[PDB]
Design a protein around this ligand. Structure first.
Ligand SMILES: CC(C)COc1cccc(-c2nc3cc(C(N)=[NH2+])c(F)cc3[nH]2)c1[O-]
Ligand SMILES: [Ca+2]
Length: 223
């Protein structure tokens, strides 16, 4: 997260760290046995870390659970990153409470101007790699489709939305991938891609979760 602030331990109880011997992507806890992340964060050998704050120190509240299966959306396209969403089932359920809690899926899509909270342990520099030890937060507004399309002409599908600051300086970045964009308490986006990080006129692009609610529900139900 570039230009964001330290969230405060456990103030984002649905945030998860996907770890394969190092933190590589974020994710969101949606029920005690399932996490939603981005399909491009897929890989085998994933350990899901819940209740984390500083990822290099065990300080208490952490639950490390291995993934039972990862289900990448069947129409995920790695070239365009359309349908960039993945569900991960955990080998055992997590114990939910106040430091570990699931976030709700939306009932409607959000509008441009809605303010949302983006969080993650991703890069904090737009030029160079500086990965933090504790969770960073950023409040960003959803942009209108016209500003999103003027910024990425020909690359925005109806399953994506832009959120951020066109002046640059504040944005999600590599490492934040797969994590949550929560607005009014509902999971509305998944960190997916962008051109560089915090560059002027190049906002972040997020998977539009409201378009996958029926799929998430049917897939969890049948697995
Ligand atoms: C291990 C894999 C997850 C590799 O994934 C990646 C490798 C390099 C960069 C990214 C990445 N840059 C990103 C930049 C932005 C942005 N400007 N708001 C974003 F929203 C997601 C990004 N994801 C990324 O997701
Ligand atoms: Ca820790």
């Amino acid at each position: 997260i570039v230009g964001g602030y330290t969230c405060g331990a456990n103030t984002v109880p649905y945030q998860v760290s996907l770890n394969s011997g190092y933190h590589f992507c974020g994710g969101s806890l949606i029920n005690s046995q399932w996490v939603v992340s981005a399909a491009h964060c897929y890989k085998s050998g994933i350990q899901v870390r819940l209740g984390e704050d500083n990822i290099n120190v065990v300080e208490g509240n952490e639950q490390f659970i291995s993934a039972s299966k990862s289900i990448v959306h069947p129409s995920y396209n790695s070239n365009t990153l359309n349908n960039d969403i993945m569900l991960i089932k955990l080998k055992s359920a997590a114990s939910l409470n106040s430091r570990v809690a699931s976030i709700s899926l939306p009932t409607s899509c959000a509008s441009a101007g809605t303010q949302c909270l983006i969080s993650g342990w991703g890069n904090t520099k737009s030029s160079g790699t500086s990965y933090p030890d504790v969770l960073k937060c950023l409040k960003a507004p959803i942009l209108s489709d016209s500003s999103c399309k003027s910024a990425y002409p020909g690359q925005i599908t109806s399953n994506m939305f832009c959120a951020g600051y066109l002046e640059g300086g504040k944005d999600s970045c590599q490492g934040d991938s797969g994590g949550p964009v929560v607005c009014s308490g509902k999971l509305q986006g998944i960190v997916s891609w962008g051109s560089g990080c915090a560059q002027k006129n190049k906002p972040g692009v997020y998977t539009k979760v409201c378009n996958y609610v029926s799929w998430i529900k049917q897939t969890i139900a049948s697995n």
